[PDB]
Amino acid sequence: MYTFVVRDENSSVYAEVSRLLLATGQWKRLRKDNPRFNLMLGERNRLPFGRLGHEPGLVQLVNYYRGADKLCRKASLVKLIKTSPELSESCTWFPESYVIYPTDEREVFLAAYNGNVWIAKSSAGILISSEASELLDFVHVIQKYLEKPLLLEPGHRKFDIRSWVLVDHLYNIYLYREGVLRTSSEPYNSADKTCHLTNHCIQKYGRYEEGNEMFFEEFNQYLMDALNTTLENSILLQIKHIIRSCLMCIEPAISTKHLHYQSFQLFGFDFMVDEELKVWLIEVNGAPACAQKLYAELCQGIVDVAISSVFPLATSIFIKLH
Amino acid sequence: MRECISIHVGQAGVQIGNACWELYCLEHGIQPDGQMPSDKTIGGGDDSFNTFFSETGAGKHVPRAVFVDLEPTVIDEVRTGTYRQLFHPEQLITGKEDAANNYARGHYTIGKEIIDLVLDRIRKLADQCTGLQGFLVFHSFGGGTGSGFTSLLMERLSVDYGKKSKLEFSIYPAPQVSTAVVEPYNSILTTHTTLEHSDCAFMVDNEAIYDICRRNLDIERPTYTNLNRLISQIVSSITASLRFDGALNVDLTEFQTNLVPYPRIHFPLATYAPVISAEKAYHEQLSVAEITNACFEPANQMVKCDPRHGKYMACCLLYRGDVVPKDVNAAIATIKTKRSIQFVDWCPTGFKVGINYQPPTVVPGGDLAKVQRAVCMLSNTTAIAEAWARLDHKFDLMYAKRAFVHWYVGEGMEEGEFSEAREDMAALEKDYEEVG
Amino acid sequence: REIVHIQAGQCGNQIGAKFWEVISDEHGIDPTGSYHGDSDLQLERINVYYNEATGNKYVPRAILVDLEPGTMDSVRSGPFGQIFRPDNFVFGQSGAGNNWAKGHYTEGAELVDSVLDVVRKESESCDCLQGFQLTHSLGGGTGSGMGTLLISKIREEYPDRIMNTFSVMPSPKVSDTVVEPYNATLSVHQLVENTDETYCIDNEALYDICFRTLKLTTPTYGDLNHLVSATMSGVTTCLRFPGQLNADLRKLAVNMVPFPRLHFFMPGFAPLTSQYRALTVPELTQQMFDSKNMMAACDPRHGRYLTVAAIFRGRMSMKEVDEQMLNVQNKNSSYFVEWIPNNVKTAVCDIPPRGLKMSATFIGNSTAIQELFKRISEQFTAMFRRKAFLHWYTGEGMDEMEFTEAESNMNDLVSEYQQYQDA
Amino acid sequence: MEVIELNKCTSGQSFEVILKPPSDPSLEEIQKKLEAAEERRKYQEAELLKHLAE
Numbered sequence A: 001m002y003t004f005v006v007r008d009e010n011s012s013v014y015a016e017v018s019r020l021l022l023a024t025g026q027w028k029r030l031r032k033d034n035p036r037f038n039l040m041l042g043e044r045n046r047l048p049f050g051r052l053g054h055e056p057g058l059v060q061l062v063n064y065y066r067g068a069d070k071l072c073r074k075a076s077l078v079k080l081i082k083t084s085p086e087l088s089e090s091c092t093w094f095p096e097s098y099v100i101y102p103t104d105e106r107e108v109f110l111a112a113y114n115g116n117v118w119i120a121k122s123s124a125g126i127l128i129s130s131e132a133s134e135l136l137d138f139v140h141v142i143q144k145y146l147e148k149p150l151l152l153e154p155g156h157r158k159f160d161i162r163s164w165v166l167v168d169h170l171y172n173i174y175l176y177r178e179g180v181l182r183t184s185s186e187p188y189n190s191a192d193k194t195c196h197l198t199n200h201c202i203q204k205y206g207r208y209e210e211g212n213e214m215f216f217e218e219f220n221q222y223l224m225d226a227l228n229t230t231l232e233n234s235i236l237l238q239i240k241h242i243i244r245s246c247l248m249c250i251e252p253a254i255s256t257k258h259l260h261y262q263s264f265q266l267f268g269f270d271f272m273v274d275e276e277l278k279v280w281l282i283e284v285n286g287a288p289a290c291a292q293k294l295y296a297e298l299c300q301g302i303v304d305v306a307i308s309s310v311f312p313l314a315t316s317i318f319i320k321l322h
Numbered sequence B: 001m002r003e004c005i006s007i008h009v010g011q012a013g014v015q016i017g018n019a020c021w022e023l024y025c026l027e028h029g030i031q032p033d034g035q036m037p038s039d040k041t042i043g044g045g046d047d048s049f050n051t052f053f054s055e056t057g058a059g060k061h062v063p064r065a066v067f068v069d070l071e072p073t074v075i076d077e078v079r080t081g082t083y084r085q086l087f088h089p090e091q092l093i094t095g096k097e098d099a100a101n102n103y104a105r106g107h108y109t110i111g112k113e114i115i116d117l118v119l120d121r122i123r124k125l126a127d128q129c130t131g132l133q134g135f136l137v138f139h140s141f142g143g144g145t146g147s148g149f150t151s152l153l154m155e156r157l158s159v160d161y162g163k164k165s166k167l168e169f170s171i172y173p174a175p176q177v178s179t180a181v182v183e184p185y186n187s188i189l190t191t192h193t194t195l196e197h198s199d200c201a202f203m204v205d206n207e208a209i210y211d212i213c214r215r216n217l218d219i220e221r222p223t224y225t226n227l228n229r230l231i232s233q234i235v236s237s238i239t240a241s242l243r244f245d246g247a248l249n250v251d252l253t254e255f256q257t258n259l260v261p262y263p264r265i266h267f268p269l270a271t272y273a274p275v276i277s278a279e280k281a282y283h284e285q286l287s288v289a290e291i292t293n294a295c296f297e298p299a300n301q302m303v304k305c306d307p308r309h310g311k312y313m314a315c316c317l318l319y320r321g322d323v324v325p326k327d328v329n330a331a332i333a334t335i336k337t338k339r340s341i342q343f344v345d346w347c348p349t350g351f352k353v354g355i356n357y358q359p360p361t362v363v364p365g366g367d368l369a370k371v372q373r374a375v376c377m378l379s380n381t382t383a384i385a386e387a388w389a390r391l392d393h394k395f396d397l398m399y400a401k402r403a404f405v406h407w408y409v410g411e412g413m414e415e416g417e418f419s420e421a422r423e424d425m426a427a428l429e430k431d432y433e434e435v436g
Numbered sequence C: 001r002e003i004v005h006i007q008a009g010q011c012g013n014q015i016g017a018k019f020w021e022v023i024s025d026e027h028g029i030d031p032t033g034s035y036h037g038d039s040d041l042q043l044e045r046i047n048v049y050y051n052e053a054t055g056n057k058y059v060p061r062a063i064l065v066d067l068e069p070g071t072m073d074s075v076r077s078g079p080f081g082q083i084f085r086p087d088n089f090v091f092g093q094s095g096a097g098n099n100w101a102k103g104h105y106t107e108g109a110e111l112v113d114s115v116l117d118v119v120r121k122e123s124e125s126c127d128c129l130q131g132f133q134l135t136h137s138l139g140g141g142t143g144s145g146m147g148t149l150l151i152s153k154i155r156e157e158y159p160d161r162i163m164n165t166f167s168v169m170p171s172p173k174v175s176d177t178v179v180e181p182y183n184a185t186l187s188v189h190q191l192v193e194n195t196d197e198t199y200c201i202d203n204e205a206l207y208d209i210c211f212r213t214l215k216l217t218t219p220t221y222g223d224l225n226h227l228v229s230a231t232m233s234g235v236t237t238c239l240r241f242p243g244q245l246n247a248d249l250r251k252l253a254v255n256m257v258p259f260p261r262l263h264f265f266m267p268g269f270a271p272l273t274s275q276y277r278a279l280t281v282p283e284l285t286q287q288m289f290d291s292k293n294m295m296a297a298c299d300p301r302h303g304r305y306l307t308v309a310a311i312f313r314g315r316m317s318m319k320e321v322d323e324q325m326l327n328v329q330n331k332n333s334s335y336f337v338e339w340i341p342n343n344v345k346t347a348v349c350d351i352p353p354r355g356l357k358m359s360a361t362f363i364g365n366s367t368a369i370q371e372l373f374k375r376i377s378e379q380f381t382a383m384f385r386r387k388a389f390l391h392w393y394t395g396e397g398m399d400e401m402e403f404t405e406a407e408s409n410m411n412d413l414v415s416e417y418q419q420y421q422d423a
Numbered sequence D: 001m002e003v004i005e006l007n008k009c010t011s012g013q014s015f016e017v018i019l020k021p022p023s024d025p026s027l028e029e030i031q032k033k034l035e036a037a038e039e040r041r042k043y044q045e046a047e048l049l050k051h052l053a054e
């Protein structure tokens, strides 16, 4: 049969993946340090990619792309977009950003600075300000804060969109058909973090939708009722464009085609939408969790698309981006 | 002209040496009886091929080579084989019983009793050199003799020939081609002891050679002959600059100057293309752009690792056959826009290129097809550290239980030598990390 | 790289004789020592086990030892009996009465010097001796007591040579006397200290294989010895034939023995058929790892493999062999220790045994072997707690303390196996 | 991309391309370590022979 190891005990998605694998009866879980595995569910940090693919006669597959951190760290993402010609400093869907160390971009930020609201943040701690000196006093990124978001009604409230994307070992790009809007319960106040930060913990509330999560069916119905457009037309075209642009840009650096081991990886893309129905990329998460109600579906999809394609057993929930 | 002496230690060193000198003779037009009709200077000369071959008054061209093994069965095949007349009997040195896959037995117990004989035989070769450059040393990491006797010999060569360069061709262990279970121990012990004595070392992972023979030569079960004839092609392309007219890598010192900016980090990655089956009925010849592009494919490297996730310190392209500079530069230009090639900040982003117009020679009856052009890329990249990490991890697994350690202590080695050698490797891994 | 073979006592000489029959047949040597083979592979390493005498004669490098003449008279009259060097028959008249003390301390001590004289003469005409292999049982008196005395004396004279034994472990199911557990416990302590590799052959497993698998209603000692001689041929294949492996006794011990005391191997063989049917590689590989094909009555699933050698003989697909070896390791993933990387070796030899187109021999260094020493220890203690049958040994000058120490040492060995089973 | 140090002969040629610029133990000691290991082997053998003598 097939064999796998679990090295990230703290991953909700792959705990569910491991559950499904064992429930097929054709997969056996080994101890964490057993080298004779087919499938590694790896740790988030310091994953030993250099030890993969050297076991005689074993096809080895891992659930992370070596090098994908370039996309999934804030400063890395800014640097990648500015320095990659297929993305450009003139990239229209990524907010004007600058890398600041406490290679440094302090002077050019001050130049452009000289609506002037910016947000300072890091993947390591969030400050939204209108004044340049306060941000600097507070590796970090200073990003143009989107002053005019699209506000849901009733509530006059901000949101962000999470899209889940699975890249398999052939570098097919699969967008999960279900995304989530993570909303603020407080009304937006441009004149208190709760109304400006949409994170679930910060909000955790529940007054308009359960757990401050709106799914695509309701959001599309809202776009029809209030703005006479659809989610596919006004938003999803841009999201699919941005996902494909990002992942195609790094494909030569990370692809495991013709490599002695194979990778897939699940990504969490986070977007903002402004009042002109323009979509902005905010961040890419390399180890996403999932919404509670979508776990069953997406995790089964990961097994169907990313694992059983390499290790076959004895309608698609994904949109293939091409 | 400055001479080079090749030294082949243990089974892997000897059998690879056989393959190399067979190929050298074909490249230079030397018959197995030592005669070389194209050489119009009888009994001497200072041509480039004389760096590897001396000459007798009878016109025989004799390899500047010593073969050493602690049991006789491998070298006896040299003594009775096709090229038996090529070597003088003093060049072929055998003991009675081998090191039994045990570094300590090759280094201490048996090495102590044969090292003075080996050095005497080398001295006899050195005495016939007008300007000896140094040594090329072929051996396995994993064998008791290849690991243990080699490291003893390298120490004594540094004593007896202090100003001479020493290059290594080292076979790194792969379970797919018969390994002893203790080869991680032997590899770490020999790398620790040899590190300061070697100026530049070319590692060849048997796993990579094995897989190239399976995929490109369509050999289901590669034998040592298949493996060694491929290895010898790569060795020949590395040493061709010492044996033919040229301006690049013309002496052993230049390998260090061009490939090794930091002394400890002296393990260049070799990549070779194309490798084409001679049984392949229909074959289309590959261009300069295609073989150069193939140099950045992990499937063609001598050690499987991923250079996209390291940094380059130096890069040398060695072409053989129908290649002109204009095509090389056009190919490099295209490759730079499409591949992840990152150099360390304190090195130029460049390539040293050597072209020899003679296409690669193939052994008649071999598995390798004759091609119009081929290339060997030598790059010092931090990605080769992956091979050290793999080996150090296997060492750690066994050493935590002291498995098999009593065999080494039984030969008079102290247990502290294990952890001393492992700590040197830990610092080596850290060195690559800081650079990369 | 010569090996010197010694066979001691009744079991040792009957199994040894069959071994020499089997490998003489494999090397093309007829009952008169003349070579009549058709392949140069038969002669390439013939000197490992045979001396060459003038007349194109090959003589086993074998010393036949016993404290009574009967079994060695049967050897000399047996098939291939004339092949042995007549000077190499060393025997007394008294017997050892199934008594370790008589073999080790009284009767055997009177004879051991003349055996060492023959060992010395064989070793002196060796270009480069590898070491010794001894065939004996542990449950009698000569093989067990004089055999281990011999090992101790050989170690003293040749401290840097390898010593291997093929040791037959007694079982109450196939027993001659009740004192076998005493004789075996006393011997096991000697083997722990003075051999580098011991192939543990359990008469219980041999009987069960003959009755259950070979469908032999009434197995005889000859039937048991057919299985042993086949296994000994298979384990020595890599010494006897020009393998690509380049293996000698020391290399084998280095690769198989991670801790000096844990050198007791479970051997196995396939096929075992109750036949002209072709055996496929999947069948060969599955059988050779099956407990029912192993010759120590221990369940490998009760322990963990430290090291494994699997030797295949005949013309077969190497690629299919590797696929099956990987598959079987997947099925036994829990049963290999993970702190010895790549601890399963696959070897292949082109020459098949007689009557088979392909076969496979298994050699496992498993912690489950502790079950064998536990059984012996139990049978020992049931008698020793009442000092039953001890007068046979104290009458030869032994003290009860020597029994207490031997039992303590074997229980220690069991503890060590358990320590690494849980590592 | 600049080509420098171009050398040509009948056998071939060589040159350098730049894409971007940048931004021991003595004999006595060896003999000692070999002799120390030999002495340890001798001590271990002498312990064996003493054990066998007992």
Ligand SMILES: Nc1nc2c(ncn2[C@@H]2O[C@H](COP(=O)(O)OP(=O)(O)OP(=O)(O)O)[C@@H](O)[C@H]2O)c(=O)[nH]1
Pocket (backbone or CB within 6 Å): B009, B010, B011, B012, B013, B015, B016, B069, B070, B098, B099, B100, B101, B102, B106, B139, B140, B141, B142, B143, B144, B145, B146, B147, B171, B172, B173, B174, B177, B178, B179, B180, B183, B206, B224, B227, B228, B231
């Ligand atoms: N490529 C290649 N590898 C070989 C060859 N011979 C042995 N090896 C590899 O070398 C390692 C074993 O070491 P050997 O060179 O045979 O041993 P040795 O140096 O003779 O030392 P001892 O026999 O232990 O005294 C293993 O990893 C083998 O796979 C060969 O001819 N070609």
Ligand SMILES: Nc1ncnc2c1ncn2[C@@H]1O[C@H](COP(=O)(O)OP(=O)(O)CP(=O)(O)O)[C@@H](O)[C@H]1O
Pocket (backbone or CB within 6 Å): A095, A119, A121, A122, A123, A143, A144, A145, A146, A147, A159, A160, A196, A197, A198, A199, A270, A272, A282, A283, A285
């Ligand atoms: N440039 C910008 N303009 C407007 N809002 C922004 C912004 N950058 C961040 N935000 C808001 O801040 C919130 C959290 O920011 P950020 O995305 O940096 O945290 P985070 O993404 O690291 C947690 P997670 O990985 O679950 O998304 C987002 O939900 C978004 O609403």
Ligand SMILES: Nc1cc(C(F)(F)F)c(-c2cc(N3CCOCC3)nc(N3CCOCC3)n2)cn1
Pocket (backbone or CB within 6 Å): B101, B178, B179, B180, B181, C235, C236, C238, C245, C246, C247, C248, C251, C252, C255, C256, C307, C308, C309, C310, C311, C342, C343, C344, C345, C346, C347, C363
């Ligand atoms: N009777 C035998 C036969 C072999 C036989 F294989 F040689 F036939 C081995 C054996 C096992 C083994 N391993 C035990 C398990 O861990 C890996 C190594 N490695 C080797 N060699 C490797 C080095 O070259 C010589 C042979 N031999 C042991 N006993």
Ligand SMILES: Nc1nc2c(ncn2[C@@H]2O[C@H](COP(=O)(O)OP(=O)(O)O)[C@@H](O)[C@H]2O)c(=O)[nH]1
Pocket (backbone or CB within 6 Å): C008, C009, C010, C011, C012, C014, C015, C096, C097, C098, C099, C137, C138, C139, C140, C141, C142, C143, C144, C168, C169, C170, C171, C174, C175, C176, C180, C203, C206, C221, C222, C224, C225
């Ligand atoms: N497999 C096998 N076991 C034997 C044979 N002869 C005796 N035995 C076993 O060996 C033990 C008796 O030892 P034995 O060799 O006869 O005594 P010894 O002559 O004093 O060494 C008992 O366990 C018997 O079961 C034999 O030919 N084959």
Ligand SMILES: [Ca+2]
Pocket (backbone or CB within 6 Å): B039, B040, B041, B042, B043, B044, B045, B055
């Ligand atoms: Ca000349």
Ligand SMILES: [Ca+2]
Pocket (backbone or CB within 6 Å): C094, C110
């Ligand atoms: Ca008497």
Ligand SMILES: [Mg+2]
Pocket (backbone or CB within 6 Å): A123, A283, A285
């Ligand atoms: Mg984040």
Ligand SMILES: [Mg+2]
Pocket (backbone or CB within 6 Å): B010, B011, B071, B098, B099, B143, B145, C246
């Ligand atoms: Mg050898």
Ligand SMILES: [Mg+2]
Pocket (backbone or CB within 6 Å): C010, C011, C140, C176
């Ligand atoms: Mg009897």
